[PDB]
Each structure stands twice: as structure tokens, then as C-alpha cells.
Amino acid sequence: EFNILLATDSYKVTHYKQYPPNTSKVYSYFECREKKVKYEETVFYGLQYILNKYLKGKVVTKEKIQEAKDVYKEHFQDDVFNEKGWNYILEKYDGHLPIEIKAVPEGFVIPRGNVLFTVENTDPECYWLTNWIETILVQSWYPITVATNSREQKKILAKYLLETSGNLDGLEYKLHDFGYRGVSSQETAGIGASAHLVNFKGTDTVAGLALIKKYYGTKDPVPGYSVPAAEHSTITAWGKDHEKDAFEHIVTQFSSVPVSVVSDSYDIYNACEKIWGEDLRHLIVSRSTQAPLIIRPDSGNPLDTVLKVLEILGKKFPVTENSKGYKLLPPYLRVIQGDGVDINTLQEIVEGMKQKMWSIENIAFGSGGGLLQKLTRDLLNCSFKCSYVVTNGLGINVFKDPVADPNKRSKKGRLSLHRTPAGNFVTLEEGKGDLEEYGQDLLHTVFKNGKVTKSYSFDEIRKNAQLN
Amino acid sequence: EFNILLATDSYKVTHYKQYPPNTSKVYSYFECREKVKYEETVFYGLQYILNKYLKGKVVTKEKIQEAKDVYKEHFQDDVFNEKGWNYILEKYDGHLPIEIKAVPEGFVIPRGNVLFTVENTDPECYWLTNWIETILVQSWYPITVATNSREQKKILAKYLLETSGNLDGLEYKLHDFGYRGVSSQETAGIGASAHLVNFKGTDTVAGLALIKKYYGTKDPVPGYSVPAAEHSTITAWGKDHEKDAFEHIVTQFSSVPVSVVSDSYDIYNACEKIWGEDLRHLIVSRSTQAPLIIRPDSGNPLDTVLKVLEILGKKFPVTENSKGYKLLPPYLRVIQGDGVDINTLQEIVEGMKQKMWSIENIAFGSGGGLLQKLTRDLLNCSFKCSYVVTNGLGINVFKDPVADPNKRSKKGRLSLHRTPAGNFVTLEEGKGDLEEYGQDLLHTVFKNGKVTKSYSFDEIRKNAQLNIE
Ligand SMILES: O=C(/C=C/c1cccnc1)NCCc1ccc(-c2cc3c(N4CCC[C@H](C(=O)NCc5ccc6sccc6c5)C4)ncnc3s2)cc1
Ligand SMILES: O=C(/C=C/c1cccnc1)NCCc1ccc(-c2cc3c(N4CCC[C@H](C(=O)NCc5ccc6sccc6c5)C4)ncnc3s2)cc1
Ligand SMILES: [Cl-]
Ligand SMILES: [Cl-]
């Protein structure tokens, strides 16, 4: 079973002896710091998952306290574990956490440098607990960063899909998650795939569906979708001389639905020009608009291969010109680039496609490691800092202001998030939120004393993160 | 509960209708493709994946029904192989009819070598080999953490030896500060365990639990830590009392090494004045066993380390060691934990060497740089089919993309061998059959739902030791 006591940074365990004596309240906040792709606005998503799966309900037990005491005794070569303080949470509160967490609604799109959630203890005996859970709470940068980075790529696709097409049809299916293999672990797969689906509807990371359903929920039958697709083993199993028989068997097996067939096993160009183009050309034309053939290259320079694949297919299938003057394949043929795609190369591909007058209706993208694994806590400066302590009945605003780095500066005091008269967001410090000059605090209590007090559906989160 | 039927790539759900008819065997392998050049990799983590996700009765009639419900909605068509899964439940009691053979964990293998192979033991489950590709390819992460960690250990031993003449304390020099940095809790444990294959110091506690549960060690725990401060336990005394926080913390942990972050307001001022004059008496008094460690969390990593060392040198008696390098008094040490990755770490030690400072003075903490800034792309960890049997005929299969020379894969049934000189070679096309029995490194670790050979963490550490060690 998961044990919360063994779920914190090792140095934190000794923290209780280090705060000022008679400290009754430790108050901390989480933000995505401004740094002086831009990544100016970040999507808040994923806190609920950590609340339900790791903090809600009874999370302290006699067993868990004894397991922890014995680990830290060897780990530290000394008895420094705060047994008495953990036991207190067990006896007085039936092992529920005396903590309050207020957060922006999940799905809200917030400019950098703003407070998105705050943590404090509700019992003065548990001043040490606020930051005890900072490590677990700080892990939300991953869901935040995936969904923010996912959504920035959605912006890019929209811009060019509108520039070359005149509409946004299918936008939500244009970036497909191919990252299940790439992620550090099964749990990360689920979280990461969940954050992508805040913005899109296509994934092959089946773990993401289970996570949404268990912790968020949706009125829809499933949060995400996919189609049959081939992989190198299925294609290469027939042997190199029978690449055409595999293609034929696979399009025949899935004729009523879209099918993605990777065509780079031996020679991408040969498959496109001769096998798809001439030998199996009759099969492609027959397919309905609803179930088209998606030719997938998986090798070479990502932009250059996309372009040359499109030129060959244009020289082999009836290509038309849409309203904006960009060339468009027939509806039974599409292309998916799923190799070497991240936010940067995605920009180069679409910009390349536009200047050679190919419309974005033709293409879709797959991203794996570039979508769910090549991201760091550093990207958005997600950080968790103490802004307010109460010691001996006196509240004082606490912050860090390193001389070397201006940016690592932390907000001071009790904080709140407000909507401005112009319609933007401002974070107020030093309890200024109490005055309510700009209206009510947008932070809502989502956790208190071991109970999840406000929850959002994945369907709300999707609507809050919609592009303007 | 975790469900294997829901733990694969969506499109693999439809692969059982794509293989050639009458396919009775699908045989695949894993390797880190040939491209700090990352020439050799440490194999670690498969045992975790075998025990947690692949052993025992991993199929139930309830799990089949769950998977069938999701997939029908997910693809919006009926494509789930209910019958194939049902066959595994009835005839094997939901145990996987799969054999996996693997190089021993801890082994250091040059790139381009097969590390393990997967094959189905029952002709009806030809579709099962690559169904579990996604779950097994995720051993790219422990392999990559263990490998990158090791490479940093190489750097640190070379410069510790040059500036010191000994490797004392080497395995405590790179300290895991990555628990907050990782994507998920499961990752934090896997990664931190992988780093402990080379070092003994970690603060990602999840790492300790994973090793004990899956690998085990004779010692009570594999990783150690000390008490240390954070920005909240300094700044909560108020800016005007940073000296009082320092004094309180050092006093509390007098008998053990204690590390305090001193850059909350002004790092230079803190070292020169608060540590240097106001609290100097409390530092000199401290024992060699439990020295004061000063940590700077801001600014340029190389510059700040030097400026801290320069200042402390002027307030504390500095000696010169056997090799002619500057060495702080035994009760005072520094630890750099901000912005450290394999690249910067090399720069810092090299920078220290230029200014004639012994590596004995320093320790490093790494967070995201150690456990998060890593991709499957770094070592080209990849899982490919190399051999199938269709219509009772064995065929060697491979992918040879024209555009990329490197992506090409091995053909046939594989084996790993050591020549009498000691270099490694993987024999393709089943030519390992020609070689004498017992030569092959790959030992069966998983067959039909049971783990058949296991290694303990102590042995894994022994296997992964550096040549210099
Ligand atoms: O390849 C793989 C393998 C991945 C993998 C996994 C693991 C490891 N390694 C790799 N998985 C492909 C899955 C996939 C990806 C994208 C799409 C798209 C749908 C769509 C779209 N909707 C949605 C479907 C229904 C309609 C509709 O059917 N429209 C027709 C249409 C139009 C354009 C395009 S472009 C590609 C398909 C397509 C279909 C309207 N509206 C505009 N754009 C697009 S894109 C469909 C399926
Ligand atoms: O501050 C932090 C920040 C944490 C954090 C967490 C999460 C997020 N954010 C931050 N974590 C400090 C933990 C830490 C790190 C490194 C070390 C070292 C020990 C050691 C060593 N030993 C080991 C102990 C016994 C002997 C011995 O003499 N021990 C005393 C000694 C000697 C040299 C040095 S050098 C630096 C320390 C030190 C201590 C020999 N032999 C040579 N090198 C080193 S390094 C000790 C403790
Ligand atoms: Cl593939
Ligand atoms: Cl810290």
C-alpha cells in the first residue's frame, strides 16, 4: 500500500525541529513563476488526482507510522522521525490530514506569476505538515506542464488549419498521443495522457482513460478515441518481399474504419509511389470518407519526408484546390507524421506545409516522448514556497529573495487571486484580498481535514481550457 | 486494480488481425541502438516489471469484461480479441504464456547488444508478444537513470582521484534531490532505485521502499541521508533573523552532518558574516563526523561554488593535501544542488580543478537533472520483432528504413556472448545454436507466469561497479 509518511523528501522529516518555536501556522502557495515558446499562460490541471488518490480519507494508520519509524531509523542512522506528531493526527483526527487547500478551478488558463493553490494546516499542532506534503503536491507540475504544452501546440494547429483551410474541422484530433511507451512509468502514462486529453480527443495511451474515469469522470462513454493502426512487427512479419500483401491484408481487414499503416519499413517512397500508388491503388479509392487510409512515415527528416510523401501522392491521386488556394488530397487518403514531433518541429512542419501550399486538412500528428516525456519542472518554473507563518500569535510575511537571482523571488504573505475590471488576473499579497477591491477570491477550498470539498468533472475542465 | 488488458497501446488491440494467417510464434528483442558518448549501458529494472505487472493470475473474467467495454466505446467498433484473452484465462488460469530471457541485472553491456527477448510459448498467443511491448519498453527509464548516474560517477571518480589521490566517499557525492521533479510517484521510486545502483545517498524515500520489496539487500536500507534545511525553515524566522535560524538549526543537529541553505537573501553575506563571524564558534566546535554543509541554491552553479569557496577560505584555516589542492577544515563542507546535470557537474569539478580546489570539499545534489531530463531517445531503447513462425516455417524479420541507417534491427533468434578477449557480440539468425551450451548470457527470467531467476540489489551493485573501483 501507499504510505504518506514515506512519501516526502528525506530532509523534510527533520523540518519540525527547525521552524521557530511556537509556530502555529505555516502557509504556502504554488505558482508557475515568471521568467524575466513563451509559455505565458498555463493550464491548471491535476491537483484533484493527488487529493483523491493520496491525501483524502484515512492516510495515517498505526501500521504506517511504525513502518515509517523503522525506515527513517536506518536511513538516518538516528531517531529523528516525528512519531508523536504523526500519532497525534491518528488519535485526534482518525488519521485524516488537518490541512486546507484552496485552488483555482481546474481547467482555468492563468498567466504566469499567479498563485494557483495554497496549503495551510488547520490544527496548530500540525504546522510541520504543510510543507511535509510539498513534495507530493509539487508533482502536479507534470500534469500542468503537459496540458499547457499540449494546448500551445493546439494554438499552432488552429492558426495554420484556419490559414490553409478556412475552418477548424477536426482540430481536436490533429495531435494524437503516441507516448505510452516513452513515459518513466505506468502512473506517469496515465497522468500525462490525461493532461493531453484536456485539449484533444485522440490517444493510444489507454492508461489515460482509466485515470480520467476513476478520479475525474465524464458524461461521455469514453474520454478519448483511436482507430486501428499497424506497427512494424505486423508489417515486417510477412517478410520483406511481401510488404504489399501485408498492406493489402490490413486495409481489407479494416475497411469500414480509418486505418493507419506505417509505410517506412523498407522504403517509404517505394511504398507510396508503387505499392500504394499502383499495386494497391484500387483498394484506396474504394474507401469512404468516414474510413480513409492514413499513410504513416516513421523515419527521415520529419518535415522533408512529409513533404516528399505528399508530392508523390499528389502525383498519383486526384489532388484538388480548396477555397484558400491550398492543395488537398482526396478524402480517402490522409497522412500522419508521428516521428520526431515535439512543439518545435510541429511548428516547422506546418509552416513548411503552408509555404509549399499544402493544407493542414491533409496531415495529423503523433507525439510520444516529445508530448509526455521531454518536459521538466523547470519549463514553467513550477514552485512551492512559504509566504506566511504565525509564531506566538504574530503573523509575519515570509519570502525568499536571493541576490543572485531576481526571479526566484517569492510572493509575501496571505495571497488571493482576483479578476480585474478589464478581465485579467491579478495576485494580491499581504492579505490585501480581504478588502475585496477587485471582487471575491477565485481560489476555492478543494480539500479540508481529509475531505475533498470541491470537485470538477473532466467535462468542465475541458470547457475551461478551451481556446479563445 | 491495475489491468493488463488496459495497459497497452490502443493500436496493439487490433494487431491480432494483422499478422499473417497461421502465425504461431512472434519473437522480439530489446536493445539500446548504437548511435559522454554513452558507450555502455547498465541493465536494470526488468525484475520490477516482471513481479509487479506480469507474474501470477493477471487475467480475470471481470478484467476481460472491463477491457471489452472500454474498447468498444474507444474505437467505436468491435475489435477487442475477447476470445484470445479468454483462452489464456481458461487454459493457463490467467497466467501469461510468455518466456523472457535476460542478461543479468547490473551488467554493463556495450550499445547495439540484445538485452532481453520475448516470445510466446503457446501458438494461440502469437499476438501476446508485442501486446506487452509497451509495458516492457518502459524499462528504458531505469536503464537510462542507472546509466546516466554511472557516467556521472565516472566523472566524479576521475576528478576526485586527481585532486585527492583516493576515492573516499565517492558513492555519497551525487545525492538524489529529484523526488519533487519526477512525473509520478511510481517514477520517483523506479528512478531513485536506479540511481542507488551507483550511489548510497538519496532523499527520494520512495526509492528505498521499491528496492526492499523487489530486489532486497543484506543491509537494512540501501540509501542514507542527513538533516538539512529548506527555504521555509529559514525564511519563517523573518529576514532580520536568518542568523537565528542558522544558530537554531546547527544546534539542533550538533552530532550529525547538517546542511543549511544559505542563499535565502544573500549567499555571499551569509558565508562571510553570519557563518564567518557571528556563528563561527559553532562551526569550529563541530566534529569531523558531523561537519556543517553549506548549500547555495541560486545563481551560476560554477561561479557561486567558487565564490563561496573563496570566501570561506579567508575565514577558515585552509590546508593543502597530498596532491597539492586546497582542502577546507574537516568541520566545513559545501554542497551544490541547483541546476546540476551531467554536463554542468563536469564543468563544476573541472572549474574547481582549475582554481586548485579538491573535490573532497564538495558534494552534489541533483533533482530533475538526475531523474526527469531523460528520454527513451538518449540510448535508443527499442523493442522489435526479429523472428516469426508462419505456416510452420521460421522466418527472420527486420525493419530496414532507407532514410535512417541506424533504425535497422537484428534478424532471427538472438543470443549474447563474450569472446575469450572479453568483448561482447550478439549472434543473429540463431547462429548461437552453433556455440557450446551455457555460453549465452541471456538466462530465462520469466516463463508462464512465474519469475524463474531473480537477483538481489547487492549483486546488481556488484555487477555495476566501475573498472577503477
Ligand atoms: O498511426 C497511428 C499509430 C500510432 C502509434 C501508437 C503507439 C506507438 N507508435 C505509434 N494512429 C492513428 C490514429 C488516428 C489519428 C488521427 C485521426 C484524425 C481524425 C480527424 C478528424 N475527425 C475525427 C474522426 C472522425 C472524422 C473523420 O473520420 N475524418 C477523416 C480524416 C481526416 C483527416 C485525417 S489525418 C489522419 C486521419 C484523418 C482522418 C472527423 N477531422 C480532421 N482531422 C482528423 S485526423 C484519426 C486516427
Ligand atoms: O543539503 C541537502 C539538500 C537536500 C534537498 C532535498 C530535496 C530538495 N532539495 C534539497 N542534502 C544533504 C545530504 C548529504 C549529501 C552528501 C553527503 C556526503 C558524505 C560524504 C562522505 N562520508 C559519508 C558519511 C560518513 C563519512 C563523513 O565524513 N561524512 C561527513 C561529510 C564529509 C564530506 C562531505 S562533502 C558534503 C557533505 C559532506 C559530509 C564519509 N565522504 C565524502 N564525501 C561525502 S558527501 C552527506 C549528506
Ligand atoms: Cl510503430
Ligand atoms: Cl530546499
3-state helix/strand/coil string of chain A: CCCHHHCCEHHHHHHHHCCCCCEEEEEEEEEECCCCCCCCEEECCCHHHHHHHHHCCCCCCHHHHHHHHHHHHHHHCCCCCCHHHHHHHHHHHCCCCCEEEEECCCCCEEECCCEEEEEEECCHHHCCHHHHCHHHHHCCHHHHHHHHHHHHHHHHHHHHHHHHHCCCCCHHHCEEECCCCCCCCHHHHHHHHHHHCCCCCEECEHHHHHHHHHHCCCCCCCCCECCCECCHHHHHCCCHHHHHHHHHHHHHHCCCCCEEEECCCCCHHHHHHHHHHHHCHHHHHHCCCCCCEEEECCCCCHHHHHHHHHHHHHCCCCCEECCCCCEECCCCEEEEECCCCCHHHHHHHHHHHHHCCECHHHEEEEECHHHHHCCCCCCCCEEEEEEEEEECCEEEECCCCCCCCCCCCCCCCCCEEEECCCCCEEEECCCHHHHCCCCCCCCEEEEECCEECCCCCHHHHHHHCCCC
Domain with B446, as residue range(s), is 1-137+376-454
Method used to obtain the model: X-ray
Which helix (H) or strand (E) segment holds residue B24: the answer is strand B23-32
Atom in ligand 2 nearest the alpha carbon of residue B179: 7
Same domain, A202 and A326: yes
DSSP state of B275: I
Q: Exposed e or buried b for every residue in B193-221, given b needs 16+ CB within 10 A?
A: bbbbbbbbbbbbbbbbbbbbebbebeeeb
**Which residue's alpha carbon is nearest to atom 12 within ligand 1?**
A260
CA distance A86 to A132: 11
C-alpha cell read off for A114: 499567479
Residue A264 Cβ contacting ligand 1 at under 6 Å:
no
Let me know: does B435 contact B84? Beta carbons within 8 Å.
no
A299 and B401 within 8 Å at the Cβ level: the answer is yes
A156 CB-near residues (< 8 Å, 6+ apart): A343, A346, A347, A350
Q: Which residues of A touch B238 (CB under 8 A)?
A: 396, 398
Clarify whether residues A243 and A230 are in a common domain: yes
Please name the residue that has the C-alpha cell 475477447: B82
Q: Is the CB of A178 under 6 A from ligand 1?
A: yes
- Using alpha carbons, list the distances in angstroms from residue A159 to A25, A170, A326: 48, 13, 15
Residues B446 and B459 in one domain: no
Rounded CA-CA distance B6/B74 in Å is 12
User: Residue A39: which region, alpha, beta or left (left: phi > 0; alpha: psi -120 to 50)?
Assistant: left
- Dihedral sign computed on CA atoms, order A275, A276, A279, A280: positive
Taking an 8 Å cut-off on Cβ atoms, the answer to whether B403 and A229 are in contact is no
From the list A26, A182, A249, the residue facing B232 with the nearest CB is: A26
Across B27-42, b (16+ Cβ under 10 Å) vs e yields bbbbbbeeeeebebbb
| Residues A207 and A237 reside in one and the same domain | yes
Alpha-carbon span B410 to B114, nearest angstrom: 9
Which residues contact residue B347 at a Cβ distance below 8 angstroms, ignoring those fewer than 6 apart?
B301, B302
With beta carbons less than 8 A apart as the criterion, state whether B12 and A231 touch.
Answer: yes
CB of B333 closer than 6 angstroms to any ligand 2 atom = yes
Q: Convert B108-142 into a string of H (helix), E (strand) and C (coil).
A: EEECCCEEEEEEECCHHHCCHHHHCHHHHHCCHHH
Which cell numbers in the block locate residue B307? 565564490
CA–CA dist A211, A217 (Å, integer): 9
As for how many domains chain A has, the answer is: 2
| Cell digits of residue A100 | 486546507
Burial status of residue A427 (CB atoms within 10 A of its CB: 0-12, 13-18, 19 or more): buried
**Residue A137, CA distances (Å) to A48, A82, A130 in order:** 10, 21, 10
The residues after which chain B has a C–N gap greater than 2.5 Å are 35
CA distance A435 to B467: 67
Which has the closest alpha carbon to B46: B33, B30, B34, B35?
A: B30
- Please judge whether B232 and A300 are an interchain contact, meaning their C-beta atoms are less than 8 angstroms apart: no
- Compute the distance between CA of residue B322 and CA of residue B16 in angstroms, rounded to an integer: 67
Give the span between the Cα atoms of A125 and A11, in whole angstroms.
20
CA atoms within 13 A on the CB side of B310: 11
Residue among A44, A155, A41 nearest A108 (CA): A44
In angstroms, the Cα distances linking B141 to B32, B37, B377 are 12, 18, 11
Residue B97 and residue B5 share a domain = yes
Same domain, B151 and B203: yes
Residue partners of A32: CB distance under 8 A and separation at least 6? A42, A110, A112, A113, A114, A116, A141, A144, A380, A381, A382, A383
Report how far apart, in Å, the C-alpha atoms of A240 and of each of A270, B21, B383 are: 13, 16, 19
Burial class (CB in 10 A: 0-12, 13-18, 19+), A325: exposed
Same domain, residue pair A396 and A337: no
Q: Candidates B335, B348, B352, B364: which one to mutate for ligand 2, based on the most atoms within 8 Å of Cβ? A: B335
Q: How far apart are CA A415 and CA A441, in angstroms?
A: 9
The H or E element spanning position B144 is helix B140-164
Q: Which residue has the cell 487510409?
A: A293
Q: How many A from CA of B366 to the centre of ligand 4?
A: 12
Shared domain check, B167 and B51:
no
B326 pocket-lining for ligand 2 (C-beta < 6 Å): no
Note whether B138 contacts A257, CB cutoff 8 Å. Answer: no
Same domain, A112 and A260: no
- Give the HSE-up count for residue A299: Cα atoms under 13 Å, Cβ half-sphere: 19
Alpha-carbon distance B275 to A57, whole Å?
45
Identify any residues that bridge with B219 across adjacent strands, giving them in sequence order: none
Q: Which residue puts its alpha carbon closest to atom 29 of ligand 1?
A: A290
Strand partners, A416: A428
Contact A439, A87 (CB under 8 A): no
A313 and A194 in a common domain: yes
Cβ A296 under 6 angstroms from ligand 1? yes
Q: How many residues does chain B have?
A: 469
Query: Does B107 share its domain with B164?
Result: no
Contact B151, B350 (CB under 8 A): no
Residues A29 and A61 in one domain: yes
Side chain identity at A139, as an amino acid letter?
A: Q
Q: Give the Cα separation of B118 and B100 in Å (integer).
A: 5
Nearest to B344 by CA among B321, B329, B330, B362: B362
Whether residues A188 and B183 touch (CB distance < 8 A) is answered with yes
Q: Counting ligands in written order, which one lies closest to the CA of residue A171?
A: 1
- DSSP strands (E only) in B187-322: 258-261, 292-295, 319-320
For residue B393, list its beta bridge partners.
Answer: B390
C-alpha cell at position A259: 486505418
Task: Take atom 1 of ligand 1 and give the residue whose Cα is closest.
Answer: A260
**B353 touches B345 (CB < 8 A):** no
Sign of CA pseudo-dihedral B274, B276, B281, B282 = positive
